[PDB]
Structure 1
C-alpha cells in the first residue's frame, strides 16, 4: 500500500570531505589481524538482495549481516574486545600481535574489572571479552532492559545490575562506582578526558567495513551509497572513516540514520555543533565527538525517522522478496534497510529518491548491526505486527 512514514532528510552543509588518518584502512587491518586470531572468526555474510533492489528501483542492495558475528548476534565485540585487549597489553606490558587468550584466561595475578553501562550489545561484547581474557566485568543496564539481555551478560560470567534509572543516569552511576572501586570504565563513546578506549573501539568496528569491501570486490561491484544507523555515531564514524579512505568521501553518498526521539547527530548536523537530546542500540544523549568529527566532515545526508521505519525494516529482512536470502535483523539492526522500504512505499517516492540520489544505477550498502537479541520483541514485530505501518 501507499503509506507515509516520517523520513526527514537533511543535507550536510558542513561537509568538507577531510579524511581521517586515525580511522582509515591501516588501523582497520590491524584490528582485523587481531580478530582473525580469535577462535570461530569468519567474515560475516554480505547478502545480495537483488530482488528487493529490482522492486525498489536500484541496482543493488547489499546487507552486511552482523547477526553472524561469532556467537554474539551483533557487531559490537569487534570494538569492545579490541579495546579490552589493547588495555590489557598496555597495562601488563604485552604485545597485541602475540596475545594468547588461553594464557590470559588461566593466568594468576592482578585482574582488571571492566565497568560499562549498556542497553544490550556493547555490554555483552565487554562481558564476552572479559570472560575470554580472564578479567572481571560489571555491567549496568537501565530500567526497562530486557531480561534476555541481562541473562546473556550473566551467562558470560559478568555481574549485571538493572537500575531504576535511565541510560544516561546509569552511565554516571557506572562512572561513580568505577572511580570509587578502581574499575576501568569501558564505554563506546568519548568525552573530555576519555578518548583512548573509544578510539580503539571505533578502529575495531572497521573490521566489518574491511570485510565488506573485500566482499564487494569479490562481487565485482562498487558501492555508490551507504546507510549507517547512528546512536552516538561510534559505528558510523569508524565504518565511514574506513569506507571513505577506500572510495573517497566525494564518491560515496553516505546517509546517517537515526530515530527522531534520539536524533542527536541529525540535530547537530543542522546546527553545526554538538546537541544533547529509544530502540536499544541507538540511544544517544550527546554525539560521540570522535564519530561526530568524521560524519560532519564526510557524511552526505542525515535522516531523522519515526520509529516504525525500523519495524518495517525488520519484517522486510525477515521475509525477503522473490528469491533473496533471509536475514534476521533486530530493531536497530534493520533501520537502515527500513529507510529504503519506507521511501519505496511513500506517496512522495519520486522526490525522496531524487533527494537521496537513489536511481536505477545505485549500489546501496546497508549494515544489519544485530539479529534478534530480544526474541520476544523480534517476534512481536515480525509475527504479531507490532509497530505496524498504518
Structure 2
C-alpha cells in the first residue's frame, strides 16, 4: 500500500564538521574497557537486514540490537553505570582500569533509571528513581525488581526533573541524570562517553563484515545518545563522509526545532522539552540532517523489525527503539519515495546503520502495536 506519513526532513545549515575529542575513539575505548570487565559482557548483535535492504533499494541495512545489553533490554545501562563508576573513582581516589568489587537519584520515563538502579545494586549503593505520571507499571516494577526506590509523580518529566533536584540537594543524594544544565555537566559527559561503547562495538562488527557505513540514523530525546554516538562515529568516519540523520517524534522535536532556529528551542524515551546542551553541540556541528516524524512511524518500525522480510533476522524493538528503521520503511511506501530517497542521499550503494535502542520494555504496548495494530498506518 502507498501511504503518506509525516516525515519532515531539514538540512543542518549550522554544520561545521568540528569534532569533539571529548567523545572520540580513545575515550570510547576506555569506556569499553570498563564494560568488558562487567560480568556477562557480550557485544550486542549487529543484524544484517539484507532482504529488507534489497526491498528498500539500498545496499545494507544494519541494526545494532541493544535489547541484548545484559538483561536490561536497553542500551542506557552503558552510560549510567560508567558515570557511577567514574563518580566513585573520583571520590575514592582510584584508577578506572581496576574494577574491584552512597545514593544515586534520577528522573526517568523508563530505561535510564533502570540502568542507574542496576548499577547501584551491582555496587552495593542505594538508588531513588523518580518517574512522571502515566509511566508504565512494568517499568516501575523493573526498578523495584532491582531493589531501588521508585516514586511516580503527578507532573511531566521536565517538572519531575526539578523535584529530583530539590530532593537531592536537601537530602544529600548524588544526581545521576542523563541531561546537562548550567552547573551540571560532569556526569552527563561520562554518560555520553559510556554510550559510545555501542558505536565502538558496531564499528568492530562492521569491519568484520568488511563494510563502510555511508549513513547513520539516530533517534533523539534530549540527544545524549545521538551526541555521544555521533561524536564517536565522526571521529572514526569523518563528519563529511557519514550522512547522519537525527530522528525525533513530531510532538517533541526539540533538536529539530533547535537546528531550524540555530539556538536552543508520545513514545517514552524521546520526550524532550529542553535539549541536552552537550548533545546539541555535537549534533549542531556534525549532524547532516534532522527529521521530525509522525508518531505512527515508530509503530511501523517495530512491526517491520519484529516480523522481518525474507530470511532476515527478527528483532524485538520498542517504540523509541524502532523509529530510525521506521523512517526507512515510511520512506519506502511514501508516494514521494524517489525525492525522499534523494534528499537523504539513500541509493543502491547506501550502507545504513540503525540503532535499536530498546526491546519490548513495555510488553503491553509492544504487543498492542505489533498484534493489535494500534497506531496503524491508516
| TMscore range, shorter length | over 0.9
For the residues of structure 2 that align with 1:16 and 1:87, how far apart are their CA atoms? 33
Deviation at 1:7, TM superposition (A): 0.3
Aligned 8 A contact 2:244 2:287 in 1: yes
Instruction: Describe the superposition over 1:249-286 as per-residue Cα deviations: whole angstroms up to 9, x where unpaired.
Output: 00000000000100000000010110xx7211111111
Instruction: Answer yes or no: is 1:76 the counterpart of 2:66.
Output: no
Q: Deviations over 1:49-87 (max 9, x none)?
A: 000000000000000000000000000010000000001
Q: C-alpha deviations, 1:301-325, integer Å up to 9, x for none?
A: 0000011000000000000000000
What does residue 28 of structure 1 align with?
A: 28
| CA offsets 1:163-199 (integer angstroms, 9 cap, x no match) | 0111111110000000110110111010011000000
Structure 2: distance between partners of 1:201 and 1:386? 34
8 Å Cα contact 2:218-2:245 kept in structure 1: yes
Which range moves more in the overlay, 367-376 or 163-172?
A: 163-172
Aligned to 1:116: 106
1:290 deviation in Å?
Answer: 0.5
Partner SS state of residue 221, structure 1: coil
Gap runs ≥5 in structure 2: none
Q: Alpha-carbon deviations, 1:7-41, whole Å to 9, x = none? A: 00000000000011110100000000000000010
**Distance in structure 2 (CA, Å) of the matches to 1:22 and 1:193:** 18
- Distance of 2:98 and 2:348 partners within structure 1: 48
Instruction: Give how far 1:91 is off.
Output: 1.0
Q: Distance in 2 between matches of 1:295 and 1:57?
A: 27
- The separation in 1 between residues aligned to 2:277 and 2:133, in whole angstroms, is 26
Answer with 9-18 or 84-93: which moved more: 84-93
Give deviations 1:227-253, integer Å, cap 9, x for gaps: 000001000000000000000000000
SS of the residue corresponding to residue 127 of structure 2 reads strand
- 2:134 is matched with 144
Match of 1:345 in 2: 333
SS at match of 2:303: helix
What is the RMSD of the two structures over their aligned residues, measured on CA atoms?
0.6
**Deviation of 1:94 (Å):** 2.3
Q: Is the 8 A contact 2:195 2:225 kept in 1?
A: yes
| Separation in 1, partners of 2:349, 2:249 | 28
CA distance in 2, matches of 1:190, 1:228: 19
Supply the distance in 2 between the matched residues of 1:169 and 1:261 (Cα, whole angstroms): 17
Task: Please give the TM-score of this superposition, normalised by the length of structure 1.
Answer: 0.96
Q: Deviations over 1:93-115 (max 9, x none)?
A: 222211223xxxxxxxxxx1100
| Secondary structure, counterpart of 1:261 in structure 2 | helix
Distance 1:88 1:145 in 2: 30
Q: SS at 1:125's partner residue?
A: helix
Aligned equivalents of 1:95 and 1:25: distance in 2?
A: 20
Aligned residue for 1:177, secondary structure, equals: helix
- Bigger CA drift: 84-93 or 310-319? 84-93
Count of residue correspondences: 378
Number of the residue aligned with 1:355: 343
On the 8 A contact 2:89/2:95 being kept in 1, the answer is yes
- Partners of 1:339 and 1:323 lie apart in 2 by 21
Cα distance in 2 for partners of 1:371, 1:67 equals: 4
* Alignment partners' CA distance in 2, 1:164 and 1:195: 27
Q: Distance in 2 between matches of 1:100 and 1:257?
A: 39
State the alpha-carbon separation in 2 of the partners of residues 217 and 67 from structure 1: 22
Contact residue 322 and residue 356 of structure 2 kept, 8 A: yes
Equivalent residue, structure 2, for 1:37:
37
Task: Give, in whole Å, the separation in 2 of the partners of 1:100 and 1:136.
Answer: 18
Q: Kindly indicate whether the alpha-carbon contact (under 8 Å) linking 2:113 and 2:129 is maintained by their aligned counterparts in 1.
A: yes
| Secondary structure of the corresponding residue to residue 331 of structure 1 | coil
Gaps of 5+ in 1: 102-111
Give me the whole-angstrom Cα distance separating, in 2, the residues matched to 1:48 and 1:99.
34
Deviations 1:332-374 (A, max 9, x none): 0000000000000001100000100100000000000000000
Residue 207 (1) aligns with residue 197 (2): yes
* Equivalent-residue separation in structure 2 for 1:96 and 1:238 (angstroms): 20
